[PDB]
Amino acid sequence: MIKQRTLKNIIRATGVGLHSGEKVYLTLKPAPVDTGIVFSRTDLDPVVEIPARAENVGETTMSTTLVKGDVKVDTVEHLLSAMAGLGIDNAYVELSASEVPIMDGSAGPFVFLIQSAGLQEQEAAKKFIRIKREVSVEEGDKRAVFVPFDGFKVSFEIDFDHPVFQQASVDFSSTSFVKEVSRARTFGFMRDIEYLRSQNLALGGSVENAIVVDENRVLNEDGLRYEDEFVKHKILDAIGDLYLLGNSLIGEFRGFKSGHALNNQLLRTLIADKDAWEVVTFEDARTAPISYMRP
Ligand SMILES: C[C@H](O)c1nccn1Cc1cc(-c2ccc(C#C[C@@H]3[C@H]4CN(CCCC(=O)O)C[C@@H]34)cc2)on1
Ligand SMILES: [Zn+2]
């Protein structure tokens, strides 16, 4: 059977908020069966806990933000992506400030820390959300779609009018999340980055945690990790946003110029349309359409 997973040991990391520029201490802890991923602002007294679910999504401009009243947890998507890629169902994520650390801009450092700590299978079946009808949302020239598929695959297509250039498809029957997606970094363009900074955003961004692009080229001295790094990172972002469903997907995602906002609308519409999905478990791992690496 495919079993739920938590962390075997706690993970501690420190780093900086991409947007706030604040220093943040992060802890991932084990959690019980059916907890989900829950973020906790431990700098506050009392502590404010915000389940990583679609209904708690507040701000969707330049990152995915979770909100409960006037308290926020910003930039959850890269860490969530790491957790979906490793099959982590249950975990507490404690943060000493409002924003998850950006690390090197990718999910790589989070996956390494997690896998160094190890995972723990738990004695309860892993629940999956299986797409049974096509669900599509559009706004302007952006589109995001779920399609029935016996496995898990993601496609993204961006239309950037810029010299540095994209589309990519990843099916997890052959693509390795760890080797081919997790290392793809955050990116931004100089004119936007300075707009953002002028609006008190992007305060922690630097070549240390992002691919920085001027009008023509990548300015990072050591260049790119993958030739299609930009689009691979969008796939990473989409994986994190989709994990806000609260369970892993059995289906296909296709994004066409979609960001955090549209991804969140897609999740909302799916949740609402209860004929388009059902919760399934696999009591025999041997016959399941997906598999996970050893814990
Ligand atoms: C998070 C979301 O999931 C997401 N993933 C993918 C994309 N995004 C959106 C996103 C990207 C960014 C973002 C913000 C800032 C920077 C940057 C930057 C460095 C600063 C400092 N540098 C100065 C160098 C010159 C000198 O040496 O003096 C140049 C410039 C890059 C990217 O913010 N939001
Ligand atoms: Zn991102």
mmCIF file of all heavy atoms in Angstrom, residues 168-189:
data_model
loop_
_atom_site.group_PDB
_atom_site.id
_atom_site.type_symbol
_atom_site.label_atom_id
_atom_site.label_comp_id
_atom_site.label_asym_id
_atom_site.label_seq_id
_atom_site.Cartn_x
_atom_site.Cartn_y
_atom_site.Cartn_z
ATOM 1 N N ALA A 168 7.844 23.142 -21.521
ATOM 2 C CA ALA A 168 8.392 21.876 -21.038
ATOM 3 C C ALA A 168 7.299 20.993 -20.460
ATOM 4 O O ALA A 168 6.272 21.470 -19.973
ATOM 5 C CB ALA A 168 9.448 22.173 -19.987
ATOM 6 N N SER A 169 7.498 19.703 -20.553
ATOM 7 C CA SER A 169 6.583 18.734 -20.018
ATOM 8 C C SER A 169 7.378 17.810 -19.159
ATOM 9 O O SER A 169 8.475 17.434 -19.522
ATOM 10 C CB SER A 169 5.962 17.919 -21.124
ATOM 11 O OG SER A 169 5.105 18.728 -21.923
ATOM 12 N N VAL A 170 6.828 17.430 -18.017
ATOM 13 C CA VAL A 170 7.517 16.566 -17.147
ATOM 14 C C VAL A 170 6.500 15.547 -16.738
ATOM 15 O O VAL A 170 5.428 15.917 -16.305
ATOM 16 C CB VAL A 170 8.044 17.329 -15.923
ATOM 17 C CG1 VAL A 170 8.460 16.343 -14.865
ATOM 18 C CG2 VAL A 170 9.286 18.157 -16.285
ATOM 19 N N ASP A 171 6.850 14.283 -16.829
ATOM 20 C CA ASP A 171 5.988 13.225 -16.403
ATOM 21 C C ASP A 171 6.797 12.508 -15.405
ATOM 22 O O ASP A 171 7.922 12.077 -15.727
ATOM 23 C CB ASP A 171 5.700 12.304 -17.578
ATOM 24 C CG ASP A 171 4.682 11.253 -17.252
ATOM 25 O OD1 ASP A 171 4.662 10.710 -16.115
ATOM 26 O OD2 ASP A 171 3.937 10.918 -18.176
ATOM 27 N N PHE A 172 6.267 12.312 -14.209
ATOM 28 C CA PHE A 172 7.084 11.722 -13.195
ATOM 29 C C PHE A 172 7.313 10.188 -13.265
ATOM 30 O O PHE A 172 8.071 9.653 -12.489
ATOM 31 C CB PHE A 172 6.707 12.290 -11.824
ATOM 32 C CG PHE A 172 7.069 13.748 -11.703
ATOM 33 C CD1 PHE A 172 6.107 14.751 -11.889
ATOM 34 C CD2 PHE A 172 8.403 14.135 -11.508
ATOM 35 C CE1 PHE A 172 6.459 16.097 -11.832
ATOM 36 C CE2 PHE A 172 8.765 15.483 -11.458
ATOM 37 C CZ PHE A 172 7.797 16.468 -11.609
ATOM 38 N N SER A 173 6.718 9.512 -14.247
ATOM 39 C CA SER A 173 7.117 8.137 -14.627
ATOM 40 C C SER A 173 8.554 8.078 -15.168
ATOM 41 O O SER A 173 9.207 7.069 -15.015
ATOM 42 C CB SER A 173 6.168 7.560 -15.683
ATOM 43 O OG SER A 173 6.368 8.174 -16.960
ATOM 44 N N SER A 174 9.041 9.139 -15.805
ATOM 45 C CA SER A 174 10.437 9.144 -16.281
ATOM 46 C C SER A 174 11.331 10.263 -15.738
ATOM 47 O O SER A 174 12.502 10.029 -15.493
ATOM 48 C CB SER A 174 10.469 9.173 -17.790
ATOM 49 O OG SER A 174 9.470 10.029 -18.285
ATOM 50 N N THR A 175 10.811 11.476 -15.621
ATOM 51 C CA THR A 175 11.541 12.604 -15.069
ATOM 52 C C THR A 175 11.762 12.420 -13.570
ATOM 53 O O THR A 175 10.831 12.035 -12.825
ATOM 54 C CB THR A 175 10.738 13.883 -15.269
ATOM 55 O OG1 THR A 175 10.322 13.954 -16.633
ATOM 56 C CG2 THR A 175 11.573 15.156 -14.872
ATOM 57 N N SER A 176 12.988 12.699 -13.137
ATOM 58 C CA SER A 176 13.318 12.794 -11.713
ATOM 59 C C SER A 176 13.061 14.189 -11.211
ATOM 60 O O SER A 176 13.750 15.142 -11.630
ATOM 61 C CB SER A 176 14.813 12.452 -11.451
ATOM 62 O OG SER A 176 15.160 12.649 -10.069
ATOM 63 N N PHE A 177 12.150 14.320 -10.258
ATOM 64 C CA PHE A 177 11.939 15.616 -9.572
ATOM 65 C C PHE A 177 13.241 16.195 -9.023
ATOM 66 O O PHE A 177 13.592 17.359 -9.287
ATOM 67 C CB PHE A 177 10.908 15.511 -8.440
ATOM 68 C CG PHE A 177 10.734 16.802 -7.695
ATOM 69 C CD1 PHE A 177 9.849 17.763 -8.158
ATOM 70 C CD2 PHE A 177 11.499 17.099 -6.586
ATOM 71 C CE1 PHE A 177 9.726 18.997 -7.520
ATOM 72 C CE2 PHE A 177 11.382 18.339 -5.968
ATOM 73 C CZ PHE A 177 10.501 19.296 -6.436
ATOM 74 N N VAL A 178 13.992 15.348 -8.323
ATOM 75 C CA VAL A 178 15.242 15.735 -7.655
ATOM 76 C C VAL A 178 16.284 16.247 -8.626
ATOM 77 O O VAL A 178 16.802 17.301 -8.402
ATOM 78 C CB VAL A 178 15.857 14.566 -6.856
ATOM 79 C CG1 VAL A 178 17.293 14.872 -6.497
ATOM 80 C CG2 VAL A 178 14.976 14.324 -5.629
ATOM 81 N N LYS A 179 16.577 15.491 -9.682
ATOM 82 C CA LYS A 179 17.697 15.814 -10.592
ATOM 83 C C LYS A 179 17.315 16.794 -11.660
ATOM 84 O O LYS A 179 18.142 17.560 -12.072
ATOM 85 C CB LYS A 179 18.206 14.564 -11.305
ATOM 86 C CG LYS A 179 18.702 13.476 -10.386
ATOM 87 C CD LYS A 179 19.272 12.332 -11.183
ATOM 88 C CE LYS A 179 18.186 11.531 -11.883
ATOM 89 N NZ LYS A 179 18.819 10.291 -12.400
ATOM 90 N N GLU A 180 16.053 16.808 -12.095
ATOM 91 C CA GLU A 180 15.684 17.594 -13.266
ATOM 92 C C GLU A 180 14.783 18.746 -12.972
ATOM 93 O O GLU A 180 14.662 19.599 -13.833
ATOM 94 C CB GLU A 180 15.044 16.695 -14.319
ATOM 95 C CG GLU A 180 16.001 15.682 -14.972
ATOM 96 C CD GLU A 180 15.191 14.679 -15.770
ATOM 97 O OE1 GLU A 180 14.758 15.014 -16.910
ATOM 98 O OE2 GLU A 180 14.919 13.582 -15.233
ATOM 99 N N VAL A 181 14.085 18.790 -11.815
ATOM 100 C CA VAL A 181 13.295 19.983 -11.487
ATOM 101 C C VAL A 181 13.819 20.807 -10.308
ATOM 102 O O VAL A 181 13.828 22.022 -10.391
ATOM 103 C CB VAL A 181 11.817 19.628 -11.314
ATOM 104 C CG1 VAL A 181 10.988 20.826 -10.854
ATOM 105 C CG2 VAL A 181 11.277 19.113 -12.644
ATOM 106 N N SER A 182 14.231 20.134 -9.238
ATOM 107 C CA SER A 182 14.403 20.756 -7.915
ATOM 108 C C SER A 182 15.429 21.896 -7.903
ATOM 109 O O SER A 182 15.281 22.806 -7.093
ATOM 110 C CB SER A 182 14.736 19.680 -6.852
ATOM 111 O OG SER A 182 16.082 19.136 -6.908
ATOM 112 N N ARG A 183 16.415 21.852 -8.830
ATOM 113 C CA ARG A 183 17.541 22.806 -8.873
ATOM 114 C C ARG A 183 17.258 24.041 -9.662
ATOM 115 O O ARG A 183 18.063 25.001 -9.645
ATOM 116 C CB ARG A 183 18.854 22.132 -9.318
ATOM 117 C CG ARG A 183 19.355 21.120 -8.264
ATOM 118 C CD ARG A 183 20.434 20.146 -8.741
ATOM 119 N NE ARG A 183 21.271 20.714 -9.797
ATOM 120 C CZ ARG A 183 22.177 21.646 -9.611
ATOM 121 N NH1 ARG A 183 22.403 22.126 -8.392
ATOM 122 N NH2 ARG A 183 22.850 22.096 -10.656
ATOM 123 N N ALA A 184 16.078 24.098 -10.286
ATOM 124 C CA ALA A 184 15.783 25.259 -11.123
ATOM 125 C C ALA A 184 15.423 26.454 -10.245
ATOM 126 O O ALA A 184 14.516 26.377 -9.366
ATOM 127 C CB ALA A 184 14.691 24.952 -12.101
ATOM 128 N N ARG A 185 16.127 27.553 -10.484
ATOM 129 C CA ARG A 185 16.044 28.733 -9.622
ATOM 130 C C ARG A 185 15.009 29.810 -10.008
ATOM 131 O O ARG A 185 14.694 30.013 -11.193
ATOM 132 C CB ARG A 185 17.391 29.430 -9.542
ATOM 133 C CG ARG A 185 18.455 28.615 -8.863
ATOM 134 C CD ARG A 185 19.808 29.220 -9.171
ATOM 135 N NE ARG A 185 20.185 28.941 -10.585
ATOM 136 C CZ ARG A 185 21.271 29.465 -11.177
ATOM 137 N NH1 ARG A 185 22.062 30.312 -10.498
ATOM 138 N NH2 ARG A 185 21.584 29.128 -12.427
ATOM 139 N N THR A 186 14.551 30.499 -8.975
ATOM 140 C CA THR A 186 13.900 31.771 -9.076
ATOM 141 C C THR A 186 14.627 32.622 -10.098
ATOM 142 O O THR A 186 15.867 32.538 -10.207
ATOM 143 C CB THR A 186 13.930 32.486 -7.704
ATOM 144 O OG1 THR A 186 13.209 31.681 -6.768
ATOM 145 C CG2 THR A 186 13.249 33.853 -7.780
ATOM 146 N N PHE A 187 13.847 33.400 -10.862
ATOM 147 C CA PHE A 187 14.437 34.350 -11.810
ATOM 148 C C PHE A 187 13.676 35.640 -11.845
ATOM 149 O O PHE A 187 12.523 35.707 -11.475
ATOM 150 C CB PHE A 187 14.501 33.774 -13.227
ATOM 151 C CG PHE A 187 13.154 33.388 -13.788
ATOM 152 C CD1 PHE A 187 12.401 34.310 -14.535
ATOM 153 C CD2 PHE A 187 12.630 32.119 -13.570
ATOM 154 C CE1 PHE A 187 11.168 33.960 -15.069
ATOM 155 C CE2 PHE A 187 11.384 31.772 -14.096
ATOM 156 C CZ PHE A 187 10.659 32.688 -14.860
ATOM 157 N N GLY A 188 14.332 36.667 -12.336
ATOM 158 C CA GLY A 188 13.682 37.966 -12.515
ATOM 159 C C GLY A 188 14.467 38.834 -13.485
ATOM 160 O O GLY A 188 15.644 38.567 -13.795
ATOM 161 N N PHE A 189 13.804 39.889 -13.929
ATOM 162 C CA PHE A 189 14.338 40.823 -14.924
ATOM 163 C C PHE A 189 14.556 42.165 -14.296
ATOM 164 O O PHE A 189 13.720 42.607 -13.550
ATOM 165 C CB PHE A 189 13.372 40.938 -16.079
ATOM 166 C CG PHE A 189 13.078 39.621 -16.699
ATOM 167 C CD1 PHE A 189 12.029 38.835 -16.221
ATOM 168 C CD2 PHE A 189 13.883 39.133 -17.713
ATOM 169 C CE1 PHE A 189 11.778 37.598 -16.760
ATOM 170 C CE2 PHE A 189 13.623 37.907 -18.277
ATOM 171 C CZ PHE A 189 12.576 37.128 -17.788
#
